[PDB]
Amino acid sequence: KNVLKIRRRKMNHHKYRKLVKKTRFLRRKVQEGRLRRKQIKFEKDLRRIWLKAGLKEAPEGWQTPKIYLRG
Amino acid sequence: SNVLSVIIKGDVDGSVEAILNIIDTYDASHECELELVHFGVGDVSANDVNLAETFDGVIYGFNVNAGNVIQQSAAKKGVKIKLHKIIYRLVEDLQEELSSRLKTSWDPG
Amino acid sequence: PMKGRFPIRRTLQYLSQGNVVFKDSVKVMTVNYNTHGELGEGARKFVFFNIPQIQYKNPWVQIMMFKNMTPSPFLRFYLDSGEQVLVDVETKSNKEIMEHIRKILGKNEETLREEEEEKKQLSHPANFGPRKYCLRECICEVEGQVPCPSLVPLPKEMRGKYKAALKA
Amino acid sequence: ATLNQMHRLGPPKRPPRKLGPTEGRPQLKGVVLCTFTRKPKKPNSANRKCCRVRLSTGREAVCFIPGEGHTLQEHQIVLVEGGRTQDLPGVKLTVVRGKYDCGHVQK
RNA sequence: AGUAAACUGAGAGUAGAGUGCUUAGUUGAACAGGGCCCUGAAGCGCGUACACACCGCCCGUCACCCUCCUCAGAGGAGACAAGUCGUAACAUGGUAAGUGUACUGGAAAGUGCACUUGGACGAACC
RNA sequence: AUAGGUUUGGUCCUAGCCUUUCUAUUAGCUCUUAGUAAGAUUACACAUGCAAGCAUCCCCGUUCCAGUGAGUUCACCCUCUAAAUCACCAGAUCAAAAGGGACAAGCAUCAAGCACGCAGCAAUGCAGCUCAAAACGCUUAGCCUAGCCACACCCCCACGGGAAACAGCAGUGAUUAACCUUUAGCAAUAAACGAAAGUUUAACUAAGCUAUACUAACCCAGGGUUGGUCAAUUUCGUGCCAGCCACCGCGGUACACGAUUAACCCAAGUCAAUAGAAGCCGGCGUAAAGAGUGUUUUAGAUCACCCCCCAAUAAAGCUAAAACUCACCUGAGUUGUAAAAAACUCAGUUGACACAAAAUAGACUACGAAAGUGGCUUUAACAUAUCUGAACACACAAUAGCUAAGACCCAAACUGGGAUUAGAUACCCCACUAUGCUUAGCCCUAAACCUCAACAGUUAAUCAACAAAACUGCUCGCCAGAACACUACGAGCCACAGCUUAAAACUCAAAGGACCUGGCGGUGCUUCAUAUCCCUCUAGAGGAGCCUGUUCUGUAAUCGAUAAACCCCGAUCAACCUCACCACCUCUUGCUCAGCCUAUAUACCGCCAUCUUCAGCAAACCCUGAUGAAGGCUACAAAGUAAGCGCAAGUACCCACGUAAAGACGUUAGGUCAAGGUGUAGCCC
Ligand code: FES
Ligand SMILES: [K+]
Ligand SMILES: [Mg+2]
Ligand SMILES: [Mg+2]
Ligand SMILES: [Mg+2]
Ligand SMILES: [Mg+2]
Ligand SMILES: [Mg+2]
Ligand SMILES: [Mg+2]
Ligand SMILES: [Mg+2]
Ligand SMILES: [Mg+2]
Ligand SMILES: [Mg+2]
Ligand SMILES: [Mg+2]
Ligand SMILES: [Mg+2]
Ligand SMILES: [Mg+2]
Ligand SMILES: [Mg+2]
Ligand SMILES: [Mg+2]
Ligand SMILES: [Mg+2]
Ligand SMILES: [Mg+2]
Ligand SMILES: [Mg+2]
Ligand SMILES: [Mg+2]
Ligand SMILES: [Mg+2]
Ligand SMILES: [Mg+2]
Ligand SMILES: [Mg+2]
Ligand SMILES: [Mg+2]
Ligand SMILES: [Mg+2]
Ligand SMILES: [Mg+2]
Ligand SMILES: [Mg+2]
Ligand SMILES: [Mg+2]
Ligand SMILES: [Mg+2]
Ligand SMILES: [Mg+2]
Ligand SMILES: [Mg+2]
Ligand SMILES: [Mg+2]
Ligand SMILES: [Mg+2]
Ligand SMILES: [Mg+2]
Ligand SMILES: [Mg+2]
Ligand SMILES: [Mg+2]
Ligand SMILES: [Mg+2]
């Protein structure tokens, strides 16, 4: 069998790698912002949990850790 | 370009025709063009608002109302509704808009 | 072609071919059998062939199977009254098991046909209604009666459009 | 697939037929925003008459104007039905002649 | 091989017109043995994305216009569509092709490591 | 489905798309009558008129009928038992609230919900319950139609608030492609009321409007189509333009476009658009698909009873060959290749010496689940007496890569230099680094492919093609046109230019897999070229002048050939003529029952080049391939036979040699419309 499909996939992959290399910095910024929004959404969901539970403040001795931050 | 798109809404067909004649007496197309998108009888309608939005036009309502729904939609879509109860008041407002597009050389007479 | 050995087992005709309709007291049927052992071949073929028929004919009966739990195959029927019926199915072919269960707990053909006649009692020939429930929709369909206007127009005299005209 | 697999997966599911340019409607009312011509894809060669119209749904689409000659100017109201013009890519509508401001084709 | 070469006539056509053309004749040679890079020919094979048939096909960059998507404007895809720089792929595509991964480069792509044959190694000895 | 059209130079397979059928809405064009049936697009806003009275006052009804489909698993079955009817009760019928069960569609890129349970009389205790057999969550939908559910302007409700309610009938504005009367009577049935005669009722009945449909009639037929699928076109006009098409396609001097003639199909309709009706037992080596590997629970199956060693892996240790380095001493050179440059003064012998890699064995085919494992020794060690079983977890996963520390002989991305090149960010040469190695973590990807899943079984009636013969049973995973897409988003991850899962929008009628023929190959082997491809022999051209042809320049001033296969060629020939060219002048039924050297050699005949300095071309048969395109040979012969044409033979010249002549089918749309004729088109003062 010929390798036309493999060639098409190879060209697409090469172009995608080149694009990611070209715009990595912008992708870095966007991904960091996305992770911040993810952390905020998780915090909001946990707050919804313990508020619907009827508590005005999170359970005593609890502080939502930063699960999405690299550090 | 220096073009004014106008929708005309009147209370009666005679009023609409009179406003149309006043519009046709326009002669200063060179300095600014006047285009009549749609004329009709009745209160400002969603169709009129949509035409105004599409052509960046202004709705001129002669002795017609525009419900709060229409006003809210016009604000949302950037359309401008101008309800006038007097023919010469409306003509003055039209001339002012023409000048804003530019005073307009067209004299209604 | 239909997947599986004996694909006929998955045809509504085969399921309806069953003849074991349990009396109203039977609620649960537990079939214990052994996957191996020549003396349990009858029970094996019973589970493989007839259980579909029994379940189809007695939908509300809970039939539950148990594999290689006891040295012998057997059926146990739990009846509504609280009675338990044990049937030793070792050495019996599946057809023998079907005959036995029909005889000891199956409704008799007399009862079945009487119930069918009772069901026939529901649909009355003389009733007029939609085709789903009655033979005829309207008495217009009976020959000799005044036919439906949509097919045979009524005389001008018998229509209100002209009765009013005459009255005027 | 085995019987157990088919039973687990249930009957096959038809995705909801994606609506065409008419949003699953026989016709739409549009306002002729502009008129122009398009070169059909090769090998066909021509200047197909098309017009950009803002449909009633608020969408802006391109409608091919059939017939020998037209007079569709700006702001005119037309009726537009489905049926893609084969030689034009993306022009997936047609103005219905004789309706609203699009008069029939002159003989 | 009476060939090459040299030399000497005649004819066609014109009123006249060629160093041209056709043709008769004289003298009259040397090599003729090795090979397959190229031209080619044949046989038997191999490959083939070409079928307007390699003057083929086809990739990518760049700028040439519309549809859609993501997007704070810009990118991505597709289509349309003639160009610019190369010839990356299809023949051993002229460095076999490709997968994963890493670095590098207008651009296809190049190279490094391992893996695949969806290449071959011409199928007795030589 | 009784199927058809469509991928290609062609065949076969898969596959999407479309056609044919039947409905419904809208639109274009058109339309005679009668009966019946059905009839806002919108849970947006409403002018107006009516839609609930009855009855000796109380009571009863206005909670019904009627309406709409916003919402939406309250409809169905069982248990119990309200309200209502049975003049009172009777239990009977009917049917609420409550409790138990059943109950739509898609999305898993919604996989965790976060108290969703139990016990106890209570106190209180236990920490449980739902969920990959789809919990929770998002979006969509009135439904299961003698009818049922839900809503009644909105705030789910409706005290309260927003506000002033047609989703009752008629009707209206807005909106949409969507558009029925601002009719009559309670005469019939139903409902309310009354003891009853009776009264009321936009329920209903009878009418009004509408080809939306059915029926019947009509003594006035329109719509669509006519290249194929698919029934059916004459002449003109246009000339890749105008335009047409459901798919394939048509239009460059038209049975596909416009007009006309005719014909075909249906017919008071026709059919443009849209929607719906037909959606899984088929497959996974190459078309999409067996997921890189192994092991569960819940389960499923019947294949369960019948029935030693070699190269696995981890650890520790060791080293034979060859390197490097250092010592000797000897020499001026070494490396580098197709040839060089660059590079080093290091090179050779002998000896000492690794944390690198493991010739021969191996022509063996074993170990491991896969990745992988081939120097030696030792320790430990290679799960399951039944098979399947992870996007649903656990443990592995070559090479590459990151992190931190060591080793570094050699090799080596990148880098630098030397070449080569039009360029050379490559291929070739040199040097060197990350890296390959050891340790501890990460990373979790491969053409992880034997592209062929596990288990059990059969070789019988085969089998699209190729490949590694065809299948049966069972199970799990996966696939449903191409591309967008090893993508974006979402999610998870020690990953930060990443990996796994993974769509959609726009676009197309194909994409694709396997073959057959042809060409092509800087394609292989073998054999040849006989003035032939190279060397070899002779004579030349390429250097000078001239003759002459052509291209260019010039002119008012031809045309044709113009790679081989043009270029002293058409011409075995131009001062006038020839002459078809240019300038000027002149003639118009004209030498011709006109004329035209005007365009078209890409309409042709005619005569030719070309391979051909070939030998094949072949009708008519037969067979092989499963009766596909296609192919058809072996002489100790195996499916070919072939008429005819060509070669050959025959013939001219001086032989039987040689030279001529001859040279088929075709190739270059090869030359000639200017030998002549000739179709088409064009000019006719
Ligand atoms: S159905 Fe009986 S009269 Fe019409
Ligand atoms: K010379
Ligand atoms: Mg691509
Ligand atoms: Mg190449
Ligand atoms: Mg190459
Ligand atoms: Mg490579
Ligand atoms: Mg490099
Ligand atoms: Mg109609
Ligand atoms: Mg709804
Ligand atoms: Mg997503
Ligand atoms: Mg309302
Ligand atoms: Mg409410
Ligand atoms: Mg109403
Ligand atoms: Mg209205
Ligand atoms: Mg309608
Ligand atoms: Mg013609
Ligand atoms: Mg594939
Ligand atoms: Mg297992
Ligand atoms: Mg797995
Ligand atoms: Mg690894
Ligand atoms: Mg190093
Ligand atoms: Mg491997
Ligand atoms: Mg990848
Ligand atoms: Mg990704
Ligand atoms: Mg992401
Ligand atoms: Mg020669
Ligand atoms: Mg010269
Ligand atoms: Mg010439
Ligand atoms: Mg020429
Ligand atoms: Mg002369
Ligand atoms: Mg002359
Ligand atoms: Mg002439
Ligand atoms: Mg020719
Ligand atoms: Mg001969
Ligand atoms: Mg000859
Ligand atoms: Mg030619
Ligand atoms: Mg020529």
Short mmCIF file of C-alpha atoms (C1' of nucleotides) in Angstrom, two decimals, chain E residues 4-5 12-13 15-21 29-31 33-48 50-51 53-55 67-70 77-79 86-87 91-92 94-95 98-106 110-118 122, chain F residues 9 372 398-401 411-415 422-427 445-451 483-486 488 499 504-507 516-529 531 533-539 546-547 563 568-569 572-577:
data_model
loop_
_atom_site.label_atom_id
_atom_site.label_comp_id
_atom_site.label_asym_id
_atom_site.label_seq_id
_atom_site.Cartn_x
_atom_site.Cartn_y
_atom_site.Cartn_z
"C1'" A E 4 34.82 6.81 -48.48
"C1'" A E 5 37.79 10.28 -51.01
"C1'" A E 12 15.58 18.17 -65.58
"C1'" G E 13 13.72 22.82 -65.71
"C1'" A E 15 14.22 32.99 -73.49
"C1'" G E 16 18.36 33.47 -70.10
"C1'" A E 17 19.46 32.03 -64.86
"C1'" G E 18 22.24 27.69 -59.32
"C1'" U E 19 28.59 26.34 -56.12
"C1'" G E 20 21.56 23.43 -56.24
"C1'" C E 21 19.04 18.72 -57.88
"C1'" A E 29 41.58 3.65 -50.18
"C1'" A E 30 42.41 2.51 -44.20
"C1'" C E 31 39.80 -0.20 -39.74
"C1'" G E 33 39.18 -5.79 -33.11
"C1'" G E 34 37.65 -4.66 -28.62
"C1'" G E 35 33.70 -3.03 -25.02
"C1'" C E 36 28.82 -1.04 -22.30
"C1'" C E 37 29.56 5.35 -19.25
"C1'" C E 38 26.09 7.40 -22.63
"C1'" U E 39 22.75 6.47 -26.52
"C1'" G E 40 19.82 2.82 -27.83
"C1'" A E 41 17.62 -2.45 -29.27
"C1'" A E 42 15.81 -7.18 -27.60
"C1'" G E 43 14.76 -10.86 -23.86
"C1'" C E 44 13.57 -12.02 -18.80
"C1'" G E 45 12.45 -9.44 -14.38
"C1'" C E 46 11.40 -5.29 -10.36
"C1'" G E 47 8.71 -0.65 -9.00
"C1'" U E 48 5.11 2.57 -10.14
"C1'" C E 50 1.99 8.57 -13.95
"C1'" A E 51 -3.22 7.25 -17.62
"C1'" A E 53 0.77 8.69 -19.57
"C1'" C E 54 7.86 11.96 -16.53
"C1'" C E 55 7.33 17.75 -21.12
"C1'" U E 67 -17.11 30.16 4.15
"C1'" C E 68 -16.55 28.40 8.86
"C1'" C E 69 -14.09 27.78 13.84
"C1'" U E 70 -10.97 29.39 17.92
"C1'" A E 77 -9.16 24.76 8.64
"C1'" G E 78 -11.43 24.57 3.85
"C1'" A E 79 -12.43 26.24 -0.68
"C1'" G E 86 12.98 25.01 -4.39
"C1'" U E 87 12.10 19.46 -6.02
"C1'" A E 91 10.99 4.83 -10.41
"C1'" U E 92 16.42 2.30 -6.00
"C1'" G E 94 18.19 10.24 -8.18
"C1'" U E 95 20.34 10.29 -0.18
"C1'" G E 98 8.05 5.91 7.05
"C1'" U E 99 6.74 5.73 12.93
"C1'" G E 100 8.24 7.86 17.80
"C1'" U E 101 11.22 11.37 19.71
"C1'" A E 102 15.21 15.62 19.93
"C1'" C E 103 17.88 19.77 17.61
"C1'" U E 104 18.20 22.61 13.30
"C1'" G E 105 16.22 25.17 8.65
"C1'" G E 106 12.61 30.17 3.53
"C1'" G E 110 17.90 17.57 7.15
"C1'" U E 111 20.30 14.92 10.70
"C1'" G E 112 20.83 11.78 15.48
"C1'" C E 113 18.77 6.78 18.24
"C1'" A E 114 15.38 2.55 17.92
"C1'" C E 115 11.69 0.42 15.31
"C1'" U E 116 8.61 -1.30 10.28
"C1'" U E 117 8.78 -3.16 4.91
"C1'" G E 118 3.68 -0.53 3.37
"C1'" G E 122 18.94 -9.71 -9.23
"C1'" G F 9 -7.00 4.52 -18.24
"C1'" G F 372 12.66 -6.86 24.87
"C1'" A F 398 12.14 -0.11 22.99
"C1'" U F 399 14.39 4.52 21.13
"C1'" A F 400 14.00 9.56 22.09
"C1'" G F 401 13.46 13.38 26.17
"C1'" A F 411 29.57 6.86 18.01
"C1'" A F 412 26.84 11.27 17.71
"C1'" A F 413 21.72 15.33 16.84
"C1'" C F 414 23.10 20.77 17.30
"C1'" U F 415 27.44 23.67 16.39
"C1'" A F 422 22.81 28.33 -9.35
"C1'" G F 423 21.98 27.93 -4.08
"C1'" A F 424 23.47 23.30 -0.03
"C1'" U F 425 20.44 25.63 6.34
"C1'" A F 426 21.54 18.52 3.01
"C1'" C F 427 23.80 14.26 0.91
"C1'" U F 445 5.31 7.62 23.01
"C1'" A F 446 6.62 3.92 18.36
"C1'" A F 447 5.30 1.05 11.24
"C1'" A F 448 4.82 -0.75 20.30
"C1'" C F 449 3.27 -4.46 13.20
"C1'" C F 450 3.38 -11.07 12.92
"C1'" U F 451 -0.75 -4.25 10.85
"C1'" A F 483 -10.94 15.84 5.25
"C1'" C F 484 -11.26 19.39 9.31
"C1'" A F 485 -8.36 15.79 13.25
"C1'" C F 486 -2.17 12.20 16.63
"C1'" A F 488 -10.02 23.14 19.59
"C1'" C F 499 0.95 12.84 26.64
"C1'" A F 504 -18.08 20.33 15.90
"C1'" A F 505 -18.70 24.33 11.99
"C1'" C F 506 -17.50 25.42 6.75
"C1'" U F 507 -16.15 21.90 2.18
"C1'" C F 516 -5.03 -5.66 -15.32
"C1'" U F 517 -3.01 -2.94 -19.49
"C1'" G F 518 0.17 1.10 -21.21
"C1'" G F 519 3.96 4.50 -20.52
"C1'" C F 520 8.08 5.73 -17.40
"C1'" G F 521 12.32 4.48 -14.29
"C1'" G F 522 19.52 9.15 -13.09
"C1'" U F 523 15.70 0.32 -12.97
"C1'" G F 524 18.41 -5.07 -12.24
"C1'" C F 525 20.78 -9.26 -15.11
"C1'" U F 526 22.02 -11.23 -19.84
"C1'" U F 527 22.90 -10.42 -25.03
"C1'" C F 528 23.68 -7.16 -28.74
"C1'" A F 529 24.27 -2.16 -32.26
"C1'" A F 531 29.41 3.03 -40.30
"C1'" C F 533 26.34 3.85 -28.81
"C1'" C F 534 32.00 4.40 -27.02
"C1'" C F 535 37.30 3.53 -28.45
"C1'" U F 536 39.45 2.29 -33.14
"C1'" C F 537 40.25 3.82 -39.86
"C1'" U F 538 39.45 7.54 -43.75
"C1'" A F 539 37.51 12.03 -45.13
"C1'" C F 546 32.16 33.12 -51.34
"C1'" C F 547 27.19 30.73 -52.91
"C1'" A F 563 13.80 18.87 -32.87
"C1'" C F 568 20.05 25.02 -52.25
"C1'" C F 569 12.99 22.93 -47.88
"C1'" U F 572 14.09 19.79 -61.71
"C1'" C F 573 14.42 27.72 -59.41
"C1'" A F 574 11.77 35.11 -58.71
"C1'" A F 575 14.39 41.14 -63.82
"C1'" C F 576 8.69 41.88 -66.28
"C1'" C F 577 5.68 37.23 -65.99
#
